[PDB]
């Protein structure tokens, strides 16, 4: 994917003024170097490959950190987690995608387990991760039947096994995911992307039966987008994010702080 | 078993890698795609769009539109500087602009920039400015003379409000850093060629806006994390 | 899954290996290469260049140019030795020279060497030396006779200051060690064939420099770490 | 990644095996071989040679 080259130009002195236009139209004055300066002739090499959407969102980043604390005593009644799925929880990522109104793509999920030891030894740990779609039964105990997973998609990780990973087809019941959404509920409530982006929940639960060591499992979640398309670009974000599925920004007794630096005077930068 | 051999790097997880990976939803059939107007294929499409420059970034106006315009006086009869700014796309105050923000997502850049100006005074108000670009390697110009010795444009306001001019890409290397240090890509000073002028019974001041965009030329590379946006402490669900 | 089989050696890290490895910067587009005069493709290109030999390495001159030249006397009327040195490319004092230093980066060598000499006395000063190479297997020659019985060259200074002569590669095996032990590749003694001579009113002494380079012949092999340079304790950033 | 499958025996070290193995000296160029009289290709060449028998092996 190439960039045009720059042609040599010459001292014009014409009746036509390409430099002069009117931005009122809403068009970006199409003027090029040549038209304004006796220019050289250059054979540009430069390539825009990298600037492709596929190269942009084509990088894996983190979207969630799920910390699970093991508890000896009542083992089978806890030691499990849940999670409302979405990208809305981690600036870095979110800021990007929130660069377009609508987007479509498949996803590559990658997991990263970390066992923080609390006794002198760890023993043998084994996790399980189940994808529970909206409508499916949520687990409620480290021993709930749901973890049988007769149909949901689960992935098992044990200690010393390389990071797991899997691919996911574009979900949603639409043509694309809604990054934003000026709409409500059928009960005029919940203004926001929350109104739609219900992908279900992601749960984990230590499998290893009752044992002797207190430990902490911290599984981070990474996500790369593949086969992409996006529509209607929007201006990028400017203030720290506060809450999921909402644009809100005003924060508890603190000034509205952008990223624009200030200066003393405009006749010196 | 086909005799194989393990490789230095194996089993690692690379955030930028690119491999196949079984799917968790076999036989799923994506919802058919459709006719969504205004698609996007490459970020450059954006940089080619004019965004407004927060020229007036004094602690005074700082959080209001007034930071986006400048003021011209009918009472200044002489070669006076009006404003100026560094060029380096990811600098201040450019950084907050469309092109800027995006450039801030990469490391190296190259191309020509398209600066446009729109005069907002009265219809009978007239003037003659001078947008000028002074190539790096020196210091901000203090006088008009000192300035116009470089690439410039004597713009005369008349009917068409706008006027675009260009900042040729004039560097030593082919590419430059998004985030500069002490280095620069020149400045754009702006002066009074003549003098703002008005008739009787008219506002003695006029506004002047400023846009920026990249040329057919422009281009980026080296994906990195933006610096114009942070997250200090968790987000509520 | 295609049935495979692991191999002895797997997962190891070898500093000299050669394998593929995913890239951390997908879609990056190297800056276009250009016309850089004087390129290099093979180290030998260098060894073929004359570098000066630190012949005079006595604790006396040791850290000044004077170590690079030799002195001839108008007062010596007889078959006197002037200087000598071992041949083995990575020996003393050769080791510090271009060719030398590089040879010091490998283990085995082979080829002929090109020794050149340049006389610096006055224009009316004249002489007749005798550069000689005595093949290993014996001991440094003590007398002129004893010396010239080997490969040599009676050089007469006249107009052209220089004169190059060659040390044929004459070994038992095809290659030899960069770093010798007690072994040798012969020596190059140098004597007075006639006598330095001058007219009245002239410096009674003259300088004699010495260069070395490899022939079309020359060649190295077996990459190893140089010994002529160390690092004792960290470097400051 | 091409789906593969590990095999019973993998990663073992067998003194009699026979596999490829990266080289520690890339681009090295062996010294040219030459005319060495009396070569050998197979041990049997030897057994075909008369050797003397220590018939008289008394402590004497």
């Amino acid at each position: 994917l190439v960039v045009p080259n720059i042609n040599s130009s010459n001292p014009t002195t014409s009746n036509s003024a390409p430099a002069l236009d009117a931005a009122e139209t809403g068009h970006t004055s199409s003027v090029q170097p040549e038209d304004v300066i006796e220019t050289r002739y250059v054979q540009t090499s430069q390539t825009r490959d990298e600037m492709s959407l596929e190269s942009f969102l084509g990088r894996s980043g983190c979207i969630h950190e799920s910390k699970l604390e093991v508890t000896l005593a009542n083992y089978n009644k806890e030691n499990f987690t849940v999670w409302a799925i979405n990208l809305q929880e981690m600036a870095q990522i979110r800021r990007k995608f929130e660069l377009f109104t609508y987007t479509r793509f498949d996803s590559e999920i990658t997991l990263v387990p970390c066992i923080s030891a609390l006794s002198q030894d760890i023993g043998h740990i084994t996790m399980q991760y189940m994808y529970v779609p909206p409508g499916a039964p949520v687990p409620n105990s480290r021993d709930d039947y749901a973890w049988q997973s007769g149909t949901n998609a689960s992935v098992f990780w044990q200690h010393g096994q390389a990071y797991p990973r899997f691919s996911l087809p574009f979900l949603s019941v639409a043509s694309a995911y809604y990054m934003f959404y000026d709409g409500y509920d059928e009960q005029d409530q919940n203004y926001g992307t929350a109104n739609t982006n219900n992908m279900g929940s992601l749960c984990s639960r230590i499998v290893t039966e009752k044992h002797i060591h207190k430990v902490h499992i911290m599984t981070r979640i990474y996500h790369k987008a593949k086969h992409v398309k996006a529509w209607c670009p929007r201006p990028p974000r400017a203030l720290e994010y506060t809450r999921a599925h909402r644009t809100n920004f005003k924060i508890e007794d603190r000034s509205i702080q952008t990223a624009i630096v200030t200066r003393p005077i405009i006749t010196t930068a | 078993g086909l005799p194989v051999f393990i490789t230095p790097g194996s089993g690692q997880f690379l955030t930028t890698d690119d491999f196949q990976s079984p799917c968790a939803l076999p036989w799923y059939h994506p919802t058919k795609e459709i006719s969504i107007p205004g698609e996007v294929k490459n970020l450059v499409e954006i940089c080619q769009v004019d965004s407004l420059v927060p020229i007036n970034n004094t602690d005074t106006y700082i959080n209001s539109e007034n930071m986006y315009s400048v003021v011209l006086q009918s009472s200044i009869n002489a070669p006076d500087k009006i404003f100026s700014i560094r060029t380096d796309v990811a600098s201040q105050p450019l950084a907050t602009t469309l092109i800027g923000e995006i450039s801030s997502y990469f490391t190296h850049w190259t191309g020509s920039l398209r600066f446009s100006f729109m005069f907002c005074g009265t219809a009978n108000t007239t003037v003659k400015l001078l947008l000028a670009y002074t190539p790096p390697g020196i210091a901000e110009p203090t006088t008009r003379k000192d300035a116009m010795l470089g690439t410039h444009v004597i713009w005369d306001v008349g009917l068409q409000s706008t006027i675009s001019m260009v900042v040729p890409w004039i560097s030593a290397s082919h590419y430059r850093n998004t985030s500069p240090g002490r280095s620069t890509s020149g400045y754009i000073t702006c002066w009074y060629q003549t003098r703002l002028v008005i008739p009787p019974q008219t506002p003695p001041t006029a506004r002047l806006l400023c846009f920026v965009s990249g040329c057919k030329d422009f281009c980026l590379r080296m994906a990195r994390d933006t610096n114009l946006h942070l997250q200090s402490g968790a987000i509520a669900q | 899954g295609l049935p495979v089989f692991i191999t002895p050696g797997s997962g190891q890290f070898l500093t000299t290996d050669d394998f593929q490895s995913p890239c951390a910067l997908p879609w990056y587009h190297p800056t276009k290469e250009i016309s850089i005069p004087g390129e290099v493709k093979n180290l030998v290109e260098i060894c073929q260049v004359d570098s000066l030999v630190p012949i005079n390495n006595t604790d006396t001159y040791i850290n000044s140019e004077n170590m690079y030249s030799v002195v001839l006397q108008s007062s010596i009327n007889a078959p006197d030795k002037i200087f000598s040195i071992r041949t083995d490319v990575a020996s003393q004092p050769l080791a510090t020279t271009l060719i030398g230093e590089i040879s010091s980066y490998f283990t085995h060598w082979t080829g002929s060497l090109r020794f050149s000499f340049m006389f610096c006395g006055t224009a009316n000063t004249t002489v007749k030396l005798l550069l000689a190479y005595t093949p290993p297997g014996i001991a440094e020659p003590t007398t002129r006779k004893d010396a010239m019985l080997g490969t040599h060259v009676i050089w007469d200074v006249g107009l052209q200051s220089t004169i190059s002569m060659v040390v044929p590669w004459i070994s038992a095996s095809h290659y030899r060690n960069t770093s010798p032990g007690r072994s040798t590749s012969g020596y190059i003694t140098c004597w007075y064939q006639t006598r330095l001579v001058i007219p009245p009113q002239t410096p009674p002494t003259a300088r004699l420099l010495c260069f070395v380079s490899g022939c079309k012949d020359f060649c190295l092999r077996m990459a190893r770490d140089t010994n002529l340079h160390l690092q004792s304790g960290a470097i400051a950033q | 990644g091409l789906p593969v499958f590990i095999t019973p025996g993998s990663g073992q070290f067998l003194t009699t095996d026979d596999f490829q193995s990266p080289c520690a000296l890339p681009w090295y160029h062996p010294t040219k071989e030459i005319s060495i009289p009396g070569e050998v290709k197979n041990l049997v060449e030897i057994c075909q040679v008369d050797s003397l028998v220590p018939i008289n092996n008394t402590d004497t």
Binding site: K226, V228 | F19, P30 | - | -
Partner: peptide, 25 residues
């Protein structure tokens, strides 16, 4: 099948749409 970039082989080992590597342009 193998191609040119900014040669090499690459067939999709997986039976499904999503599993494939990154797209082309």
């Amino acid at each position: 099948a193998q191609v040119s970039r900014q040669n090499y082989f690459n067939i999709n080992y997986f039976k499904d749409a999503a599993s494939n590597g990154a797209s082309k342009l």
